[PDB]
Ligand binder design. Structure first.
Ligand code: AKG
Ligand code: FE2
Ligand code: ZN
Ligand code: ZN
Length: 472
């Protein structure tokens, strides 16, 4: 392979993007990033012909599929090993037995005819402050959720986003994530008979695209409770700090499988199925389920489906075209996409699930500490967002109540209880940071954090005395 003296034929600079591949014809060497290859192709070709050579050599030659039941499907050294979850072989089998996973109880999932029935049922169960079960809504009428007119599809997405827009795409059989241009995904998607590999994107975030951001929006009730929306309203606080996760477009090939996970930061999500179908395998956020999921995530084993060792916790919910799925914090889920699909969805945090949010946060942190793969990613600016919400929103409310001599439990009890819960988690962050220094990714200076905490402590103490002053 490449020695000190050879030139990248792309950038002409000398000695994964920045690893090397050589053209089997030219013999010239390239940085992967300079080779003309997209990231999802880096590992695909056994014989690589660079773009200067293709006109006379024909296309690069891919590795032969030798181990369809392994992530490393190109490795003869793995033919003998066990079938890995998510591999082509595993999925083709799972499809035949998946409909035998039990349906969920009425306590776990509520199916309703439309948004009006959703609103009734939601409120009957306590509203957002008490949101604890999954909802599937058959018709979006009444959800007050802006979605594109049916028929709308990938073609229109690439038209709006642009052909060269990069999307983080799951190589399903390899169970790994690589960037791929939207137009490239479009090309592979529209080729229905030739699918050596399956692709699935989950994270095309379009909230900063002026055209798209108007086409597809969260249900109004989500906008009303989203903590990010409260802090960075429709448009103080830098735009480049906003967690950008509330407007995602998702598209997947038939057969695609996403393995069990809890959404990052313990966020809640909505999904509207514009085209196709999704099947969710879900388990409720109990302490026992978390522990079992934690064990599963930290195990080196790749052959056991979580559903099979979850003591019957995993349930099956089908969501078909035109239907909408709403999941609160902490639900453990895997997803199969049985048919080519186009989906709009998004993640959000809200005060009503604050406790569960922090529990998922602790789980995440526990898992992180034990496995060496930060390729999993977590809620962007999670901690920062809380410092800002405490300071700009919660502290403000407590202070105003204190100046008015008001007992918050009367008209603002939820604000008061959320503050206490948020504060206790933030005391823990503060201590950690005074003990170990800032995080790698810390925007707020240690000192600014301390000023906020000093002020929070004080107003909490003042409100507590106001509440006690009614004692006799
Ligand atoms: O549709 C999929 O494959 C995965 C959806 C999901 O659970 C996620 O994006 O968080
Ligand atoms: Fe998810
Ligand atoms: Zn280069
Ligand atoms: Zn060449």
């Amino acid at each position: 392979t490449p020695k000190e003296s050879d030139r990248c034929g792309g950038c002409g600079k000398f000695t994964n993007d920045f690893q090397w591949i050589g053209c089997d014809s030219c013999q010239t060497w390239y940085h992967f990033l300079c080779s003309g290859l997209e990231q999802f192709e880096y590992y695909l070709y056994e014989k690589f012909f660079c773009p200067k050579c293709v006109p006379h050599t024909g296309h690069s030659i891919r590795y032969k599929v030798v181990a369809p039941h392994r992530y490393r499907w190109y490795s003869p050294n793995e033919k003998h090993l066990g079938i890995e979850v998510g591999s082509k072989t595993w999925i083709e089998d799972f499809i035949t037995r998946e409909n035998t996973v039990p349906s969920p109880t009425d306590d776990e999932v509520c199916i309703v005819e439309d948004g009006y029935e959703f609103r009734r049922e939601f409120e009957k169960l306590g509203g957002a402050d008490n949101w604890g079960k999954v909802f599937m809504v058959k018709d979006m009428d009444g959800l007050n959720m802006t979605m594109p007119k049916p028929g709308f599809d990938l073609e229109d997405v690439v038209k709006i986003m642009g052909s060269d827009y990069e999307v983080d795409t799951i190589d399903v059989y390899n169970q790994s994530t690589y960037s791929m241009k939207l137009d490239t995904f479009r090309k592979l998607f529209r080729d229905t008979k030739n699918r050596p590999l399956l692709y699935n994107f989950l994270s095309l975030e379009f909230s900063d695209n002026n055209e798209m951001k108007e086409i597809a929006k969260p249900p109004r009730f989500v906008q009303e409770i989203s903590m990010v929306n409260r802090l960075w309203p429709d448009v103080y606080l830098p735009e480049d700090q906003r967690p950008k996760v509330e407007q995602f477009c998702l598209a997947g090939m038939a057969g695609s499988y996403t393995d069990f996970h809890v959404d990052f930061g313990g966020s809640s999500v909505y999904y509207h199925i514009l085209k196709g179908e999704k099947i969710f395998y879900i388990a409720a956020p109990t302490e026992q389920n978390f522990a079992a999921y934690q064990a599963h995530e930290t195990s080196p084993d790749t052959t056991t489906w979580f559903g099979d060792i979850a003591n019957g916790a995993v349930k099956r919910v089908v969501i078909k075209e035109g239907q909408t799925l709403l999941i609160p914090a902490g639900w453990i889920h895997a997803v199969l996409t049985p048919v080519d699909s186009l989906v709009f969805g998004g993640n959000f945090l809200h005060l009503g699930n604050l406790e569960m949010q922090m529990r998922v946060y602790h789980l995440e942190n526990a898992i992180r500490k034990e496995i060496r793969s930060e390729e999993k990613f977590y809620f962007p600016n999670f901690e920062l967002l809380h410092w800002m919400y405490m300071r700009n929103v919660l502290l403000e409310k407590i202070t105003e109540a204190n100046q008015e001599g008001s007992d918050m439990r009367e008209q603002e009890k939820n604000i008061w209880t959320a503050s206490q819960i948020m504060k206790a988690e933030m005391e823990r962050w503060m201590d950690r940071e005074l003990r170990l220094g800032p995080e790698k990714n810390a925007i707020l200076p240690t000192d600014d954090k301390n000023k906020i905490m000093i002020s929070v402590r004080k107003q909490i103490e003042i409100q507590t005395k106001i509440q006690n002053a009614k004692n006799k």
